[PDB]
Ligand binder design. Structure first.
Ligand SMILES: Nc1nc2c(ncn2[C@@H]2O[C@H](COP(=O)(O)OP(=O)(O)OP(=O)(O)O)[C@@H](O)[C@H]2O)c(=O)[nH]1
Ligand SMILES: Nc1nc2c(ncn2[C@@H]2O[C@H](COP(=O)(O)OP(=O)(O)O)[C@@H](O)[C@H]2O)c(=O)[nH]1
Ligand SMILES: [Mg+2]
Ligand SMILES: [Mg+2]
Lengths: 50, 427, 51, 430
């Protein structure tokens, strides 16, 4: 990981940096589309990361 | 004051004639609403040849639209120029032939025939002088073949002295939409020789070739192919609809092009076909229309006229032109190559001039050709049929609908007799 | 009002015909744009210019 | 109106029909609760105001899959009384599904067919779904097709039957059920489209690049095949192919009604961008022997009749240019007495893509359902396995006790062997 430039803004974390709601961050894995994504990622054994 | 009764059958008939009535109504100036907007008085002079007078100034075409599936009728009604037809002339079934000539001719076509003769007879006695019946259908299918050729047979015994122009597309070797197309075509031609007065032989393999190499069209659709036939169907009866220096009715063409009663199949070509890129290079003169007229590439049939001699030819010229060099050009090609013409008919080519050109063109012409080369497209369907019939393939979809194998044998009996007569005059 | 079912089926037929008309006009526009393509329509002009 | 009824029998029937009606509601924009936010009349019956019901029956002897639809994401879609359940399953017993526990559930099944027949104005066929490897799919599939022929005469039946694979199969007594059910579907199904799970396993592995496919992945591309088969009725196209047009252009003889199936573009989105999917490119992919959905080698036999269902932006010219190059190819063989063996079907609507499926958004697709003589190898391999089964008479007491007679295996033996004789002599030249 490259070292940050001097006088860095100390950037805020990603979730409420881009504006995720509490319902979305609680049920990220409960959504049907995320479930289908996880199913296809399971199906692609080693080619998931390809 | 003569009238042409128009009948379209099947998907091909309802789609060709959609472009046909688009061309003709635009040529006479009828709007898609149904009123008159013609610039010249000659357009309104002959409305009766294709259109019926209606109350309130409406002009309704003399078209009887039929098929066995209502899906195609929704396309022709809802398209442009689609509301001019009578709704009651939209006679249709609901079962569908399903590419079966046995179904279209015997089982479920027959109930719909009683509906269409009510429409035709009401329309026939509506007009005062029947010039003839014009029909457009397909031979490869089953909706326009079985139902179409029973309609031709039934209106023959009701009106025997009237003409019968049949625009029929035929199955092709290179392009094949239907598996059972040799069964439907051969059984339709056998029912066409003794009934049809004269046949306009068309095909899809020639229109695709014309649209590709002549019009330079990268993506030709059926509507592009329908425009080529629609220009022809207006060009055959062009002298009926307008005055001219030398006029030609349907029976003018029938008496000239039919030497013997069974030789009533003709090949057709349309002359002023040029791509928009090549339009500026062409100089529109009669020798340039004639040189495209007699070229085998511009013909709209699979038959190559270089293989067989021309039994009799025709010429349907439209536009202002000179009757010397029109007549000189027809006899100049008869002497440039007399091997391609039959010897015992001096002056094979018949000519006729109409002074009203179509929309967007200043000069145009239409070619009708009676050649013995059209035996090539009859042998080609028959050789496909006799390959299937020996193994009796796909037969239970025909013999299960009430016909024997004897009708197939007599279908090839007339088919082999038709090529026998055409081969004899080639020698 | 007493014969609302006749009006209902008449309106159903009218809506069916209108929907088929809209679909066929859209398809007609698409096939007209497809049929407009030819040699006069600009193709390979970039090839001629680069040559 | 072009209106058809789909019948799903057995565990494979309910799971395939879940994937088919997911595609069917998405094609017409039907939300899962049944609300539209008239091309839907082929499958969806408009009830009253703003509500659409499937024209399907889900009958199965085990209840555990029928209540899964009742509690899944499509509870509000299906009419609850069309979904037929039973107390217990047949459990790979053709005797049970046809004789013992098939009696009390086929009377409720025919009553739903009777109510659906009067609701539809013009019926065009029955799309029957079953698996011949299972007891309910065979036994109740056999018994329902017996009753359909007597009650409903001359109406077409589209049979998409899942057939056992030579190598990979999930049960031991599949050669008993597949052979016995062959007698029923030979005389009664007008069109029998074979399906093989191992070929669809191989289709998924090499094309979709999905190396652990599950039953959801197989049924999703089965759903595309059934949808593209019937896509001509629902949406207007250049060359419409009715249901009745398939029988008149695929089967030349009554006893020969088995056809293969193949879907040409099975392409993931990471493969879709780099690949130019043209009509000539996908027509070659349709006739690929390894792209067939049934594990057989079409090079071994001779093609008898072929049907091509094109979808999307397919001009009617380049399909003919693709067909002409197919005919000139010497690897594909045609029988001599069928010189024109192609049926072409062009529909203007591109196939929809399910959110969550592995398939990508492709403009054009081809569904190829063709008849060949290479499908005699399909019944011959199961004829060898059933020969070993009946020789020492294993697992017969599970069949003899539950109604069946001993000679019922024998009568199903030469009947499938006469199918071998019929397919051998028809493709032979003369
Ligand atoms: N492709 C595919 N095949 C399936 C699916 N579900 C079941 N099968 C097939 O069904 C076979 C097992 O027999 P089944 O049809 O499930 O038997 P059943 O329907 O449960 O009937 P009984 O066993 O008597 O209760 C397996 O070999 C599978 O090939 C599915 O979802 N997709
Ligand atoms: N030129 C032309 N040919 C068509 C058209 N529609 C269909 N065909 C041809 O008709 C053949 C099939 O005919 P079919 O539609 O089954 O006729 P039907 O059974 O009477 O409806 C195909 O080989 C097509 O080439 C059209 O609009 N124009
Ligand atoms: Mg005169
Ligand atoms: Mg079960």
């Amino acid at each position: 990981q490259p070292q940050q430039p001097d006088g860095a803004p100390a950037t805020v974390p990603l979730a409420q940096s881009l504006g995720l709601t509490q319902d979305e961050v609680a049920g990220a894995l409960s959504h049907p589309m995320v479930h289908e994504l996880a199913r296809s990622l399971y199906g692609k054994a080693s080619g998931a990361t390809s | 004051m003569r009238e042409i009764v128009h009948i379209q059958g099947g998907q091909c008939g309802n789609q060709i004639g959609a472009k046909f009535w688009e061309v003709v109504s635009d040529e006479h100036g009828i709007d898609p609403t149904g009123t008159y907007h013609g610039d010249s008085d000659l357009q309104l002079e002959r409305i009766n040849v294709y259109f019926n007078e209606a109350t309130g100034g409406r002009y309704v075409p003399r078209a009887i639209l039929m098929d066995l599936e209502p899906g195609t009728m929704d396309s022709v009604r809802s398209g442009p120029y689609g509301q001019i037809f009578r709704p009651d002339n939209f006679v249709f079934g609901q079962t569908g032939a399903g590419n079966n000539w046995a179904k279209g001719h015997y089982t479920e076509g027959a109930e719909l025939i009683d509906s269409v003769l009510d429409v035709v007879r009401k329309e026939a006695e509506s007009c005062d002088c029947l010039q003839g019946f014009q029909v457009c259908h397909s031979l490869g299918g089953g909706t326009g073949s079985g139902m179409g050729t029973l309609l031709i047979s039934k209106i023959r015994e009701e009106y025997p002295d009237r003409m019968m122009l049949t625009f029929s597309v035929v199955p092709s070797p290179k392009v094949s939409d239907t598996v059972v197309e040799p069964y439907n075509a051969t059984l339709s031609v056998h029912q066409l020789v003794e009934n049809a007065d004269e046949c306009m032989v068309l095909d899809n393999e020639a229109l695709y070739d014309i649209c590709f190499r002549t019009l330079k069209l990268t993506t030709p659709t059926f509507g592009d192919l329908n425009h080529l036939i629609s220009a022809v169907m207006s060009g055959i009866t062009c002298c009926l609809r307008f005055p001219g220096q030398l006029n030609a009715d349907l029976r003018k063409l029938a008496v000239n092009l039919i030497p013997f009663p069974r030789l009533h199949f003709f090949m057709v070509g349309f002359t002023p076909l040029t791509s928009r890129g090549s339009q500026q290079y062409r100089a529109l003169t009669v020798p340039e229309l004639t040189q495209q007229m007699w070229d085998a590439k511009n013909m709209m049939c699979a038959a190559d006229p270089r293989h067989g001699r021309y039994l009799t030819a025709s010429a349907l010229f439209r536009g202002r032109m000179s009757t010397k060099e029109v007549d000189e050009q027809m006899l100049n090609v008869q002497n440039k190559n007399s091997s391609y013409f039959v010897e015992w008919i001096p002056n094979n080519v018949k000519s006729s001039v109409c002074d009203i050109p179509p929309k967007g063109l200043k000069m145009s012409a239409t070619f009708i050709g009676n050649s013995t080369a059209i035996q090539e497209m009859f042998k080609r369907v028959s050789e496909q049929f006799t390959a299937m019939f020996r193994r009796k393939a796909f037969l239970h979809w025909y013999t299960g609908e009430g016909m024997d194998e004897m009708e197939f044998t007599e279908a090839e009996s007339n088919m082999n007799d038709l090529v026998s007569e055409y081969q004899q005059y080639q020698d | 009002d007493f014969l609302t079912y006749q009006g209902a089926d008449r309106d159903q037929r009218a809506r069916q015909r209108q929907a088929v008309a809209v679909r066929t006009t859209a398809r007609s526009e698409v096939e007209a744009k497809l049929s407009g393509l030819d040699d006069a329509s600009g193709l390979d002009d970039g090839r001629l210019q680069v040559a | 109106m072009r209106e058809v009824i789909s019948i799903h029998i057995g565990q494979a029937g309910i799971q395939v029909g879940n994937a088919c009606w997911e595609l069917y509601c998405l094609e017409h924009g039907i939300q899962p609760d049944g609300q539209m936010p008239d091309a839907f009349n082929t499958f969806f019956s408009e009830t009253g105001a703003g509500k659409h019901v499937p024209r399907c029956i889900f009958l199965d002897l085990e209840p555990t899959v029928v209540d899964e639809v009742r509690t899944g994401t499509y509870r509000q879609l299906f009419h609850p009384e069309q979904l037929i359940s039973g107390k217990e399953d047949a459990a790979n017993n053709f005797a049970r599904g046809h004789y013992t526990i098939g009696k009390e559930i086929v009377d409720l099944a025919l009553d739903r067919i009777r109510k659906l027949a009067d609701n539809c104005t013009g019926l065009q066929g029955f799309l029957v779904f079953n698996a011949v490897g299972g007891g309910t799919g065979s036994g109740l599939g056999s018994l329902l097709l017996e009753r359909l022929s007597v009650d409903y005469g001359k109406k077409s039946k589209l049979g998409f039957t899942v057939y056992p694979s030579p190598q990979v199969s999930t049960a031991v007594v599949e050669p008993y059920n597949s052979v016995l059910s062959t007698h029923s579907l030979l005389e009664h199904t007008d069109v029998a489209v074979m399906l093989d799970n191992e070929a669809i396993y191989d289709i998924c592995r090499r094309s979709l690049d999905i190396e652990r496919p599950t039953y959801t992945n197989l049924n999703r591309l089965i759903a595309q095949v059934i949808s593209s088969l019937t896509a001509s009725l629902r949406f207007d196209g250049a060359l419409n192919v009715d249901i009745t047009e398939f029988q008149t252009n695929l089967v030349p003889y009554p006893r020969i009604h088995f056809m293969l199936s193949s879907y040409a573009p099975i392409i993931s989105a990471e493969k879709a961008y780099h690949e130019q999917l043209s009509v000539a490119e996908i027509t070659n992919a349709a006739f690929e022997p390894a792209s067939m959905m049934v594990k057989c080698d079409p090079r071994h036999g001779k093609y008898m009749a072929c049907c091509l269902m094109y979808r999307g932006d397919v001009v009617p010219k380049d399909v003919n240019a693709s067909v002409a190059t197919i005919k000139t190819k010497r690897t594909i063989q045609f029988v001599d007495w069928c010189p024109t063996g192609f049926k072409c079907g062009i529909n203007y609507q591109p196939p929809t893509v399910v959110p969550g499926g592995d398939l990508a958004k492709v403009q054009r697709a081809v569904c190829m359902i063709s008849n060949s003589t290479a499908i005699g190898e399909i019944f011959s391999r199961l004829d060898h396995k059933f020969d070993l089964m009946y020789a020492k008479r294993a697992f017969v007491h599970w069949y003899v006790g539950e109604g069946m007679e001993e000679g019922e295996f024998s009568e199903a033996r030469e009947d499938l062997a006469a199918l071998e004789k019929d397919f051998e002599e028809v493709g032979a030249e003369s």
